[PDB]
Write a protein that binds this ligand. Structure first.
Ligand SMILES: C=C(C)CCOP(=O)(O)OP(=O)(O)O
Ligand SMILES: C=C(C)CCOP(=O)(O)OP(=O)(O)O
Ligand SMILES: [Mg+2]
Ligand SMILES: [Mg+2]
Ligand SMILES: [Mg+2]
Ligand SMILES: [Mg+2]
Ligand SMILES: [Mg+2]
Ligand SMILES: [Mg+2]
Lengths: 340, 340
């Protein structure tokens, strides 16, 4: 697994080389290399690795030649670039301080709001790689449309996330279970969970609408759990482990935690949450954290993680066939009980 | 021409309807409609109109059925959406105040840096329209790749533009004719001039590499002239006419004007430019404008506009064949002597 991660990371130098190969644009290409090095490295590479692992499990080993395997790790890196693009942009919009153990790319002196165009370049690099390696393949168009559709779905999710979290406005009424499930389905589940398995499926020749629908049932549910864990870690995670500083409380976000708080709060506790949520004051944030702990939300999260795991396992039993259950089980093992 | 513009604008309501048609995403789709209405309307629609006019001139009238014409005005609107995406993002990065006679979308109270995701949605809408109307056409993939390549080229151009214009740093050494030509080729010429004619060419079945190369020779030169005019208007244009407020001097930009100033300045005038360029102080900006006027740069621009027009006309004579010269002449007439 760590050796699998290591093999995937060793292909990054080739990805950068092929993307940063007209002398007039030299300075811009040198900036793109810096944008790639800073923002596509430091994560867990779960999405990129899922493409590589799923491709190997879905394709007959006699058909896994050197060019086929290169295409698989390249498409894995395309999914990492999609993630990099959204994170660079999301860190500006969320006013975040750190990412993957280092200062946010936009927080770097000399970068600032120029990171908007840098994010756009990362997105552009996906289609440059798809054209360079997969142009002659029968699944080329299926991959292009899958990455474009995954970006649109993420952007729609980001729009819902930002509309539910207006700055300077009390938004407790908007923080419902229904709203939450809708935000996380689009902003996380589609591109972080459906996209990597769907890409390996199209590369394996599995283009069937019914097969993709079945994979989607498992993967969108896994994505919802993953975002619930991300919301828990925003406040109760170790920043030395998570690599990022939480901002959901200050940013008035429709977090899984605030939705649970609102379902369990007394009128007195509702007032405390109303007066202290969505504000930059450190003592107001500390007051919301104290309310969550009073309502035993960390324990409520532990019980949800268990119930959700069993539910996802039941969905693998129902919808994995005819794909190897290991395709979905490998990703479940990688995200369950994770504190990073 | 104004009737042609009117026919094109009358199709916008249909574009919005088809793009803003899952009740859970309702609030986000309502935000997308607001993003579309605010940012894709108010311009001159030259790019969108060029697609429609070029398609009509390149396709035999017996092959111009109702569905074919709809595809043409839809692809015209895709080019307007590409422009909208880049302008929303460019206005944030350039710290601009107004656009198309109204306050910049990001300057709107309640929008702010959420405009980054709004720009991404506008870009996403291009591929949604291409899929909705052109998916079954033989040129579908050619159009997808052309819009993706045009975005990458624009982003590379924007990177060069921002690298040459660092905030708080004296960048006069970097402002060369060579650097300028490179920036404007990528940031403007490819997507504003090559993209609309190339799209109509692929829709007409003209996919030949040599035909696209010849069209490119004319159109990249036209794009350079158009950006030189844009730089002139940034300072010497009427904001009631241009619809936007200039920021090139304050933003330390490699403008055509500053390049010309540096070629004509004495050591005393160079010192004046060095002490006053790239700064927010109104009196420093007024000092640079006074230097430009002392060096008769508005007259130097008038002489360049004439010389460039003749050169572009000579390029149409050389490279228009076998395409109707009217394809290129119509766009030249629309941009030459324009003060908007
Ligand atoms: C979609 C969300 C929850 C953002 C972070 O994803 P990861 O937690 O997988 O971050 P990296 O490993 O890529 O850094
Ligand atoms: C590529 C540059 C010069 C930006 C503005 O283009 P236009 O001057 O054509 O602006 P609109 O008509 O679309 O508003
Ligand atoms: Mg965030
Ligand atoms: Mg966010
Ligand atoms: Mg989070
Ligand atoms: Mg600008
Ligand atoms: Mg600009
Ligand atoms: Mg300008």
């Amino acid at each position: 697994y760590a050796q699998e991660k290591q093999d995937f990371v060793q292909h990054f130098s080739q990805i950068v080389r092929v993307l940063t190969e007209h002398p007039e644009i030299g300075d811009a290409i040198a900036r793109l290399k810096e944008v790639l090095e800073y923002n596509a490295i430091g994560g867990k590479y779960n999405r990129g690795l899922t493409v590589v692992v799923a491709f190997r499990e879905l394709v007959e080993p006699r058909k896994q030649d050197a060019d086929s395997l290169q295409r698989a790790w390249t498409v894995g890196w395309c999914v990492e670039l999609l993630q990099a693009f959204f994170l660079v942009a999301d860190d500006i919009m969320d006013s975040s301080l750190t990412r993957r153990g280092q200062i946010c790319w936009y927080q770097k002196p000399g970068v600032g709001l120029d990171a908007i165009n840098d994010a756009n370049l990362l997105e552009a690099c996906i289609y440059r790689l798809l054209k360079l390696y997969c142009r002659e393949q029968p699944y080329y168009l299926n991959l292009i449309e899958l990455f474009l559709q995954s970006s649109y779905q993420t952007e729609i999710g980001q729009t819902l996330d930002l509309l539910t979290a207006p700055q300077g406005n009390v938004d407790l009424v908007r923080f419902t279970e229904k709203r939450y499930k809708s935000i996380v389905k689009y902003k996380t589940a589609f591109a972080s969970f459906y996209l990597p398995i769907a890409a390996a499926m199209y590369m394996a020749g599995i283009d069937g609408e019914k097969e993709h629908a079945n994979a989607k049932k498992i993967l969108l549910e896994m994505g919802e759990f993953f975002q619930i864990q991300d919301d828990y870690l925003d406040l109760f995670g170790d920043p030395s482990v998570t690599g990022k500083i939480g901002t959901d409380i200050q940013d008035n976000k429709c977090s899984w935690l605030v939705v649970q708080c609102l379902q369990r709060a007394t009128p007195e506790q509702y007032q405390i949450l109303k007066e202290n949520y969505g504000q930059k004051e450190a003592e107001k944030v500390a007051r919301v954290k104290a309310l969550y702990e009073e309502l035993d939300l960390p324990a409520v999260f532990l019980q949800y993680e268990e119930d959700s795991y069993s539910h996802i396992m039941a969905l693998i039993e129902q919808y994995a066939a005819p794909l190897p259950p290991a395709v979905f089980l490998g990703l479940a093992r990688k995200i369950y009980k994770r504190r990073k």
